[PDB]
Amino acid sequence: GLEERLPGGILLSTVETVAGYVRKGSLWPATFGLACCAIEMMSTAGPRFDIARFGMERFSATPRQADLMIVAGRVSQKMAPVLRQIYDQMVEPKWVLAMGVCASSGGMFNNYAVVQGVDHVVPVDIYLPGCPPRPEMLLHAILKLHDKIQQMPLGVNREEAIREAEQAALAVPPTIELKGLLR
Amino acid sequence: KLGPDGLGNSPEHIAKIMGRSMEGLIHHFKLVTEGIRVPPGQVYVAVESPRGELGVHMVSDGGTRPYRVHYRDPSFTNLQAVAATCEGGMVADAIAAVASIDPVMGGVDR
Amino acid sequence: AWACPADAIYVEGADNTADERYSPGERYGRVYQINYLRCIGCGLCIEACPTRALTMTTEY
Amino acid sequence: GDEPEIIAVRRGMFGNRDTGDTSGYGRLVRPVALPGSTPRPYGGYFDAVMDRLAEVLGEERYAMSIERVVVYRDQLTIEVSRVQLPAVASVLRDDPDLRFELCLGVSGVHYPEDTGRELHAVYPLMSITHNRRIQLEVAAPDADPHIPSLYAVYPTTDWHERETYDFFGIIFDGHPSLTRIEMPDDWEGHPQRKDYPLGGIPVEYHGAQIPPPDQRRSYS
Amino acid sequence: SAPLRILVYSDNPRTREQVRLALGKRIHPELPEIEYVDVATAPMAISQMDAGGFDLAILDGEATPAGGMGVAKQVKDEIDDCPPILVLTGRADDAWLAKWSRAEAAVPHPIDPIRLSDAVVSLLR
Amino acid sequence: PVEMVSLTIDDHEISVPKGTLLIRAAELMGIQIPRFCDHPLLDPVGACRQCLVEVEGQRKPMASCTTTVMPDMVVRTQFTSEAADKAQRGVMELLLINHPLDCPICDKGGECPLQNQAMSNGRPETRFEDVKRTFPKPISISSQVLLDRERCVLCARCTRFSSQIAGDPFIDLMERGALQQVGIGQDKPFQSYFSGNTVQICPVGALTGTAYRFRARPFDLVSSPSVCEHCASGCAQRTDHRRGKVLRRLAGDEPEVNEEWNCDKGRWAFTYATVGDRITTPMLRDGGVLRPASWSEALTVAAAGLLTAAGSTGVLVGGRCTVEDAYAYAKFARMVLNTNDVDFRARPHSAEEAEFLAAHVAGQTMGLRYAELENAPTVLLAGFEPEEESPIVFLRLRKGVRKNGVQVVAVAPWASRGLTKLAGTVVPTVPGDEPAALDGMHDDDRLRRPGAVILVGERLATSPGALSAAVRLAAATGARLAWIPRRAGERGAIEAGALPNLLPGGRPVDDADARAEVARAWYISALPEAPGRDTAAILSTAASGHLAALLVGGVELGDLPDPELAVAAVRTTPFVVSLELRESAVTELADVVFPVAPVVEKAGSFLNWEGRPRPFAPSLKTNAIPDLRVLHYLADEIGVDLALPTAEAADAELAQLGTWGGARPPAPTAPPTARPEAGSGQAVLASWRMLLDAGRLQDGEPHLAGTAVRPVARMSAATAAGIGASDGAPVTVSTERGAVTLPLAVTDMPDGVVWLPMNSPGSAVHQRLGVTAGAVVSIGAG
Numbered sequence A: 001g002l003e004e005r006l007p008g009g010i011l012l013s014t015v016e017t018v019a020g021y022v023r024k025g026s027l028w029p030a031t032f033g034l035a036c037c038a039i040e041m042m043s044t045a046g047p048r049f050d051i052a053r054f055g056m057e058r059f060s061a062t063p064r065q066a067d068l069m070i071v072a073g074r075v076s077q078k079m080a081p082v083l084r085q086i087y088d089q090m091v092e093p094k095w096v097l098a099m100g101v102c103a104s105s106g107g108m109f110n111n112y113a114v115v116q117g118v119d120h121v122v123p124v125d126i127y128l129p130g131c132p133p134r135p136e137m138l139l140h141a142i143l144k145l146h147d148k149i150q151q152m153p154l155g156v157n158r159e160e161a162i163r164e165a166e167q168a169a170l171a172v173p174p175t176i177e178l179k180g181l182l183r
Numbered sequence B: 001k002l003g004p005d006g007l008g009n010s011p012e013h014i015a016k017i018m019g020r021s022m023e024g025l026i027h028h029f030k031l032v033t034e035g036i037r038v039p040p041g042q043v044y045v046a047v048e049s050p051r052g053e054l055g056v057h058m059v060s061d062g063g064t065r066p067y068r069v070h071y072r073d074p075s076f077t078n079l080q081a082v083a084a085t086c087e088g089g090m091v092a093d094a095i096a097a098v099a100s101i102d103p104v105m106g107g108v109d110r
Numbered sequence C: 001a002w003a004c005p006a007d008a009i010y011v012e013g014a015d016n017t018a019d020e021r022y023s024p025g026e027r028y029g030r031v032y033q034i035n036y037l038r039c040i041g042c043g044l045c046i047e048a049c050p051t052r053a054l055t056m057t058t059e060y
Numbered sequence D: 001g002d003e004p005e006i007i008a009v010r011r012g013m014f015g016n017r018d019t020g021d022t023s024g025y026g027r028l029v030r031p032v033a034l035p036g037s038t039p040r041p042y043g044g045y046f047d048a049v050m051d052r053l054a055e056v057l058g059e060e061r062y063a064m065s066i067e068r069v070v071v072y073r074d075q076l077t078i079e080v081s082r083v084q085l086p087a088v089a090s091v092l093r094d095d096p097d098l099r100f101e102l103c104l105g106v107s108g109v110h111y112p113e114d115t116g117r118e119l120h121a122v123y124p125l126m127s128i129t130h131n132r133r134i135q136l137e138v139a140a141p142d143a144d145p146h147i148p149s150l151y152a153v154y155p156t157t158d159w160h161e162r163e164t165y166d167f168f169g170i171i172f173d174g175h176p177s178l179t180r181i182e183m184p185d186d187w188e189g190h191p192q193r194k195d196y197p198l199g200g201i202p203v204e205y206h207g208a209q210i211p212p213p214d215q216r217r218s219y220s
Numbered sequence E: 001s002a003p004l005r006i007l008v009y010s011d012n013p014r015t016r017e018q019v020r021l022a023l024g025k026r027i028h029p030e031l032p033e034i035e036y037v038d039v040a041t042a043p044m045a046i047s048q049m050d051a052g053g054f055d056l057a058i059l060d061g062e063a064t065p066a067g068g069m070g071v072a073k074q075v076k077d078e079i080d081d082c083p084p085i086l087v088l089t090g091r092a093d094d095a096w097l098a099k100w101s102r103a104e105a106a107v108p109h110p111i112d113p114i115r116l117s118d119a120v121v122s123l124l125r
Numbered sequence F: 001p002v003e004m005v006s007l008t009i010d011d012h013e014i015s016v017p018k019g020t021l022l023i024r025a026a027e028l029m030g031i032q033i034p035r036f037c038d039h040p041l042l043d044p045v046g047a048c049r050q051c052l053v054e055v056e057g058q059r060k061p062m063a064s065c066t067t068t069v070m071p072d073m074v075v076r077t078q079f080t081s082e083a084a085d086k087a088q089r090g091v092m093e094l095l096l097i098n099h100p101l102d103c104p105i106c107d108k109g110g111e112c113p114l115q116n117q118a119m120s121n122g123r124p125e126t127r128f129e130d131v132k133r134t135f136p137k138p139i140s141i142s143s144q145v146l147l148d149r150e151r152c153v154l155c156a157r158c159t160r161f162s163s164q165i166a167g168d169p170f171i172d173l174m175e176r177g178a179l180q181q182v183g184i185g186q187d188k189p190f191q192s193y194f195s196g197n198t199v200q201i202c203p204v205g206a207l208t209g210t211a212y213r214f215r216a217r218p219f220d221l222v223s224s225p226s227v228c229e230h231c232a233s234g235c236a237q238r239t240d241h242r243r244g245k246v247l248r249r250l251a252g253d254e255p256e257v258n259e260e261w262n263c264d265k266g267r268w269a270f271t272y273a274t275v276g277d278r279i280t281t282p283m284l285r286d287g288g289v290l291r292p293a294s295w296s297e298a299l300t301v302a303a304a305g306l307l308t309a310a311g312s313t314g315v316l317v318g319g320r321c322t323v324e325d326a327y328a329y330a331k332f333a334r335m336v337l338n339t340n341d342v343d344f345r346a347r348p349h350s351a352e353e354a355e356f357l358a359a360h361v362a363g364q365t366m367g368l369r370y371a372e373l374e375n376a377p378t379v380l381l382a383g384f385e386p387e388e389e390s391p392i393v394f395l396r397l398r399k400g401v402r403k404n405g406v407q408v409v410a411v412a413p414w415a416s417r418g419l420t421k422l423a424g425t426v427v428p429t430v431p432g433d434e435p436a437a438l439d440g441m442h443d444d445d446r447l448r449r450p451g452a453v454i455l456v457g458e459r460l461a462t463s464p465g466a467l468s469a470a471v472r473l474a475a476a477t478g479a480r481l482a483w484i485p486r487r488a489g490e491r492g493a494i495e496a497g498a499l500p501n502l503l504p505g506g507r508p509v510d511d512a513d514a515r516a517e518v519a520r521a522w523y524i525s526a527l528p529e530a531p532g533r534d535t536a537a538i539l540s541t542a543a544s545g546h547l548a549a550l551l552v553g554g555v556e557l558g559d560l561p562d563p564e565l566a567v568a569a570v571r572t573t574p575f576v577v578s579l580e581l582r583e584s585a586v587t588e589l590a591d592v593v594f595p596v597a598p599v600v601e602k603a604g605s606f607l608n609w610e611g612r613p614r615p616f617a618p619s620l621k622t623n624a625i626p627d628l629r630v631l632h633y634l635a636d637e638i639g640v641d642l643a644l645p646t647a648e649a650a651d652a653e654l655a656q657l658g659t660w661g662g663a664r665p666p667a668p669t670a671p672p673t674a675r676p677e678a679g680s681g682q683a684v685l686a687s688w689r690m691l692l693d694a695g696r697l698q699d700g701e702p703h704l705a706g707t708a709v710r711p712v713a714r715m716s717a718a719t720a721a722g723i724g725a726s727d728g729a730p731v732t733v734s735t736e737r738g739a740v741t742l743p744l745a746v747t748d749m750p751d752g753v754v755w756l757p758m759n760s761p762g763s764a765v766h767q768r769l770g771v772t773a774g775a776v777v778s779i780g781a782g
């Protein structure tokens, strides 16, 4: 993309901020509800709430027009290939919201049949607790993702941010080693 | 019960089990932790869920956990009608037929 | 933690030594973690708690 | 057989599979027996249904087919002998007095401690005409998990025979195509068998992790 | 003569340490020297493999923000002539997905040093 | 023929052996009668009155735990008698009125017999509106056991155990009436080695383990069957671990081995693997410093060093290894290193011991069993202290003494508390004179009695000719001779080879037929024929520089008879490969170090002194690998396929080989060499390792160490007078190597003999004096 070839400075900064503002709005979800969390996405679209208020009313049926893949459900083993295919068939930029405990970590279903978290097959940008998450929680997670998108870098800034995030992530100890106050 | 702190065990129950009743405390502890133990047996119980007969075959081996729980979810059987209700019609008619079956895949797969 | 069906609570107890007491009685919850990516909001935990120490607020 | 069907033998008080948290309580031996044959005067319409079944089936055939009759919690379960399942199913469906037109499915259950009868298939049958309900129970050994498929009599058993094969490996021979329906065809093992592990992962926590419930202690 | 370059991807530094410990400077004296490139983030791993010059990639299936199996599928769908992929699976039942990821080999957690070394040798040979 | 009586419980008839208790008959029939004070292994006491049942012809309800079955008795429990149910529920109510509302904080919660039996046989709500009895809680009765008297139901199981099972009545029911309470005397701690069993025997949270306190509830424990790795008893156990850390090890239930008992060592000595000294990665020596190395680099370096060592290599296997691990060491040495220099004796030993083990132990499994010690009319202990070594042997011997009137005789310098608890008789012998006493006992009619038994400890090896004397005594009298080592893996090592003169299955090395048989079993051309060196020979050769390399697996050099020689040997050896679990003296001097999985993380099997197989699967799934696999892949790198990728493979290979079954090797027939004579200010040193001592596997458990017996130098009154010492005053025993100072205890020993704890803190006899038992040591006051 030529927007990436643009050199740093005020030009690239303004392109980044405009792209972030544009993409946070019109963040069309993919029509990809699973399990019971899908009912909560539909409720979020329902009149009591209004997903449309965030420009997200158009649930792109095809992955091509979808920007956000709200997994929103428990991913069974047989479904992981399908979910990955859908994610791939979306086009850049792509974001994944792991709505519900099942999508995020397998939730209550810690067994063979469930994948134990969407992130096992596609990069997850926001994790959303709840079983299901009530629509306000979904909107909260979506707004957090909007904030994340707004700050998303581009071009040389994207490369530098990737390198810096790598440098930071290489050092964080694993959760298993946070033994604070354990006997 | 509710309070300024939130939803939680009512203070009356807390007082009964932590201050006054030893048997009450034992019963709370056991029924909460491992729960009741159901006499060994094998039962089939059906209800009229919105999509048809939701059946439950449940088997207990006398323990505190269900030995075997199986749901005859009506959607699972109803989906066998898709071949009859879709074959011969258009894809648009297939959409309507499937919607009429009104499957809930959670009950289908379980 | 015992009653949680999703194993979403990890708790470890410790003695309420006289030099450092955190709760009445001889035990307190030194380490208490809820894995909200495993919590299903069932509420069995608060039903289980014998001290009303654990409640469920309306914050979500 | 005539004694109640022992499905598991638990040793020691407090329903503990392991050696015992407290010494001296592990010596109790209590067999876990599912109810045996009911005395003949079955309650309600069960008596009539069995009388009709024994009338339509010959006395010899009735003896060969019906292994047990269990009236538990006012519910009738005919422990039908394998092989004869299609015959009794046809009799129940077609006979005007029985007329169990609606077979509700096939449920698999596993009894690894039930020698020669580890796998059980349960057929909940309902007669809307007479408004009656019964269950058929067919037992197959783990070594020979074959059972006659009722597809000819009750087409609905398709996707139920397939599901129970997927989750238990019960081979419903004669089934048009006994392929896996829930698990991928490439899957290894039959998940709902008791020997099949739960397959969970430890739940992570800062500084710790909780193994899956199947690995941890239990007092069933 | 070229030092084989191996990409080790895992959010957990201890999994990377274990991988880099089971494998050493040389898997065997008959094999070339080994150089390790640790990556903790999926974007960084994708960028590294885009630059190419890798003989093997070890992807942790348990990686938190982006699991290893997803990265394996992505790299085999995105990088032409990508190196063989070895995936670390967090459980036995993940084996099926390990096949779906098309990773040339799968090694369950906890990482058995000898099993990992043998799989790596088989992939490099 | 056992007499079967028959009776009806409820309405079901059953036949049981005469003398059976009603509670046991109900158990066999499947009726769950509530019980607190009853214990199958304790003599019935009928205290709690919880097990009351209605018996026809008796006005009162009868405690089923005290009622012997009768040939026509009619019994109806709470399931079929309103009177019995009412009695049991009233007893439960009276049991709960004074109980504390402590279930949330009680350690026993979730696994409490009181909770379960109150649910099953108790009322739903209290009627006790009055004031509850209260005690200060929790008071400590020892360094390990906390006592919460308020929860005590006064079932006396703790006291009844500490009196009957273990002869250690340091806890008893104090006070009277409602004030009655289990307690220690004033401050004298509960000193039993089996004190932990009282924690597992308490039906409530009264007695609790201070280590396990508040660590976990039953639901979050991963619990696995296990075998204790400490000594040769091979007790079945249940290892409970939370978040990958072992929290406790309960006694399990193996009627044929340990019934339901442990010693404190097995119960609590599990922290050794987590004290921070564990080796986590392979280590390599470079520039004189030991630094972490990749598995590949370490394996390559070790293979290169061992190949450059050709056949000049020794293999010290140690006694910790499982049977499979010992077999791996033997196979590696005799196939890869092509040497017979394999020795598991990381302790005082002799060639006579090797000959005796080959002739009378190897291949001869299950010859004597615990069930037979329980019935042997006479038991002769030679060089063996059942309490200090193999405590469950002591428990079985005490059981036999109490029930079947077993007579125990000990050829020991003095009567240890264990021997006193066995009611045994000492044959006072200065160490080194054991052969004399054993030969002199040929005419003892007590041994002539059928089923008589001789138990020979490993220490008897240190006395020249003593094992030969014991074999002669067994042959003459016909008493079955059984050899009981300290460490768990020693018998497995014998069955797996690991000795210079033995091949797997007791197959002698000095036998062409046996050698060819094993070679065929291993798919190898031929095995080494040169005689193997023992541990002492290997160490002496290495110290002289004639040994090219050493393969040391789990050996504490301090445990060797001459640890200075051992360190000199390992240092002078050009190349040292360590298969070690924790940083040790060998590790500090090794060129390559390989971390090996601890017992809790590895599959395998031990062989108790009976030769009984004691299998166990891993409890902690971890990347750590056994000695077996490390050796297998080291051999693979060396280019020889050990064919032992896993413990299952080793077990299968050993089964395929089977026992020798041919010509058994000759008896040791060693001569009874003259004992050294101690002059003025000198005494012959006696010693044996205390159960709770400075053993490495006991590290990380300060409470257990605190429970250890007080170290004291024990002397005869005359000997103490000769040196000018007084009872309780410090006494120093010294040799050119060094000195050991301990408080003196007059013990009515033979004159001129001084006894020390072999490895108790501040004693370390091998480390400090550099001599074993039977040596002459200068004695002095202060």
Ligand SMILES: CC(C)=CCC/C(C)=C\CC/C(C)=C/CC/C(C)=C\CC/C(C)=C/CC/C(C)=C/CC/C(C)=C/CC/C(C)=C/CC/C(C)=C\CC1=C(C)C(=O)c2ccccc2C1=O
Pocket (backbone or CB within 6 Å): A030, A031, A032, A033, A034, A035, A038, A039, A041, A042, A045, A057, A058, A059, B103, B104, B105
């Ligand atoms: C090109 C250029 C630069 C030119 C220069 C000038 C310039 C800049 C612009 C020129 C003009 C242009 C080109 C403008 C751009 C915009 C444009 C062209 C148009 C796009 C925007 C557009 C078409 C807007 C209107 C479309 C519209 C009305 C959309 C709303 C659609 C609605 C109502 C969607 C909601 C549907 C919904 C509730 C979805 C939930 C379903 C999901 C996800 C769950 C899945 C699911 C389902 C569906 C079950 O059935 C179910 C049943 C039972 C259990 C479970 C489930 C389950 O899991």
Ligand SMILES: Nc1nc2c(ncn2[C@@H]2O[C@H](COP(=O)(O)OP(=O)(O)OP(=O)(O)O)[C@@H](O)[C@H]2O)c(=O)[nH]1
Pocket (backbone or CB within 6 Å): F230, F318, F319, F320, F321, F322, F346, F486, F487, F553, F554, F555, F556, F559, F579, F580, F581, F582, F583, F584, F596, F597, F598, F599, F627, F689, F694, F695, F696, F697, F698
């Ligand atoms: N190779 C190997 N070494 C082990 C194993 N288990 C323990 N060790 C090590 O072996 C060394 C020697 O143990 P021991 O001489 O028996 O010391 P101890 O067991 O504490 O004391 P005693 O057994 O009473 O003599 C210790 O330093 C341990 O680190 C094992 O399974 N394999």
Ligand code: SF4
Pocket (backbone or CB within 6 Å): A034, A035, A036, A037, A072, A073, A074, A099, A100, A101, A102, A103, A107, A130, A131, A132, A133, C040
């Ligand atoms: S998180 Fe809860 S509501 Fe959402 S799919 Fe999973 S189980 Fe259903």
Ligand code: SF4
Pocket (backbone or CB within 6 Å): C003, C004, C005, C006, C007, C008, C009, C034, C038, C039, C040, C041, C042, C043, C044, C045, C046
């Ligand atoms: S709401 Fe409480 S009890 Fe229920 S799953 Fe979440 S943490 Fe566990």
Ligand code: SF4
Pocket (backbone or CB within 6 Å): B026, F099, F100, F101, F102, F103, F104, F106, F107, F108, F109, F110, F112, F113, F114, F115, F151, F203, F204, F205, F206
């Ligand atoms: S001993 Fe049993 S009844 Fe008493 S407080 Fe502890 S768990 Fe509760």
Ligand code: SF4
Pocket (backbone or CB within 6 Å): F151, F152, F153, F154, F155, F156, F157, F158, F159, F182, F201, F202, F203, F204, F206, F207
């Ligand atoms: S301390 Fe435990 S074993 Fe001892 S009398 Fe009290 S309840 Fe019984």
Ligand code: SF4
Pocket (backbone or CB within 6 Å): F228, F229, F230, F231, F232, F233, F234, F235, F258, F261, F262, F263, F264, F265, F266, F267, F390, F391, F392
């Ligand atoms: S007697 Fe020996 S085997 Fe038994 S628990 Fe104690 S140390 Fe372990």
Ligand code: FES
Pocket (backbone or CB within 6 Å): F034, F035, F036, F037, F038, F045, F046, F047, F048, F049, F050, F051, F052, F063, F064, F065, F066
């Ligand atoms: S158990 Fe029999 S009276 Fe106590």
